[PDB]
Write a protein that binds this ligand. Structure first.
Ligand SMILES: CCCCC[C@@H]1O[C@@H]1C/C=C\CCCCCCCC(=O)O
Ligand SMILES: CCCCC[C@@H]1O[C@@H]1C/C=C\CCCCCCCC(=O)O
Lengths: 174, 174, 174
């Protein structure tokens, strides 16, 4: 059985991210350029802070006909005491993509499948949908609420942004 | 149930690849050196362009007794609209190796197993055989034509090098 | 069926490791800093040299209230002629963590699950317990001797440090 899990990734500009390591000779992004990053992670219903994203984007090429970039990404999604999911695959600044779920830990031990990446604001807001197989149990209800409709206007609940107990999961990752 | 999938990876020198980020003190390759890369990918029977490889080789050490290098590699194999496969493991410039299949997306959702890497011409021609488990369906026939036996003299079909419709899969990755 | 596999990772200061690639505008580790590394790997009972670790630590943040750093790690564990295990997930210099097992090769083909990381001496001694699922066979006896309980004072057997045949596995990775 497949369990669907959606989350919002938001860059609130307070984690030094992204860091651009410019090694390609061009003013535009190119092969050689490396981009370590870490953003905040919220539930799909935007009610609770769950953790962070964390990893590395490797520039593969500039795509002038689409006015954007192709990256190859290696990173994880942290859900506090619930554990984490790890992924590998493409991030295209100009269109949606699917990444491979490489594994997980905690409640995500044994995870496999794929995840859809949808960019809403380049690069500060993204919406993910994980198609999770291999989990030992049903996902906890506080992670499976109906998602807010994805758009460039989405915002976390005020309590979540402010890190009030009602707006965070237990030991949310920071 | 294992499904064998073979592909040829070819560096045609038109993707700015490899990019060498030389940070080690050694005059030879050494720990600290990083090599982002992206090559072209063709079917095992060399009749069609399918996509690209994309990722990062991390130098681990120079191996002077073998006149070559050990890399630790993290990268993906793209097959146009069919999806992609992701891998992790050793790339040794001086001998064949096996890498882990970390997962996949599209028709490769659920992929697991190992892949054999055989270098045919250093650094421009490599042959892979994926021993794929976990897939939902039989691989499409377009991808499973009988492979050309590997040797240093192999070449992709002229029509595939020229990107003619009969020499590419639909929406091949580039 | 879970098979537990424990190993010790030791930096004996003879592999040029770790290599720090400094890009954060900070005296402390920060986002932008990259750390390619490779350490020696010994069996859990400390009787035998098996191989090496090899990969990349990506700094995510300095955590001053915990007097340590958060890294995102992508790397492999090499076991000589037996094959390798690959992983993805968090390395926290200040506490234990669990990483995803992303896959394997050789006798580790098909591996999945999670692995516990325990730091013993920062940064030179670590202990791991892999909770391995998906393997084709029982692990070989020379890898599954009763582990030495982790403590800061552990040392590999003298025969293993001296690379005598009784203290190594066949074709131990180096
Ligand atoms: C793979 C998922 C990535 C999620 C977004 C995360 O931010 C990374 C994306 C990597 C590179 C995007 C590049 C955009 C450049 C603008 C940033 C401004 C700056 O701080 O210099
Ligand atoms: C993910 C497992 C880590 C294994 C330990 C291996 O050594 C790498 C860990 C990466 C970074 C540790 C930081 C070392 C700082 C040492 C300071 C001294 C120096 O500048 O050489």
């Amino acid at each position: 059985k497949v369990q669907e899990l959606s989350v919002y990734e938001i860059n609130e500009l307070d984690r030094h991210s992204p860091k651009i390591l410019k090694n390609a000779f061009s003013l535009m992004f190119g092969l050689g350029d490396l981009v370590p990053f870490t953003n905040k992670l919220y539930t799909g219903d935007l009610k609770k802070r769950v953790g962070i994203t964390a990893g590395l984007c490797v520039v593969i090429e500039h795509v002038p006909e689409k006015k954007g970039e192709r990256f190859e990404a290696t990173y994880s999604f942290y859900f506090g005491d619930y554990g984490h999911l790890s992924v590998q695959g493409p991030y295209l600044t100009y269109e949606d993509s699917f990444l491979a779920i490489t594994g997980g830990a905690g409640i995500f031990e044994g995870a496999y499948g794929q995840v859809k990446l949808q960019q809403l604001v380049y690069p500060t807001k993204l919406f993910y949908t994980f198609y999770l197989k291999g989990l030992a149990n049903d996902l906890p209800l506080e992670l499976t609420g109906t998602p807010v409709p994805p758009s460039k206007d989405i915002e976390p609940a005020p309590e979540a942004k402010a890190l009030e107990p009602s707006g965070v999961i237990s030991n949310y990752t920071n």
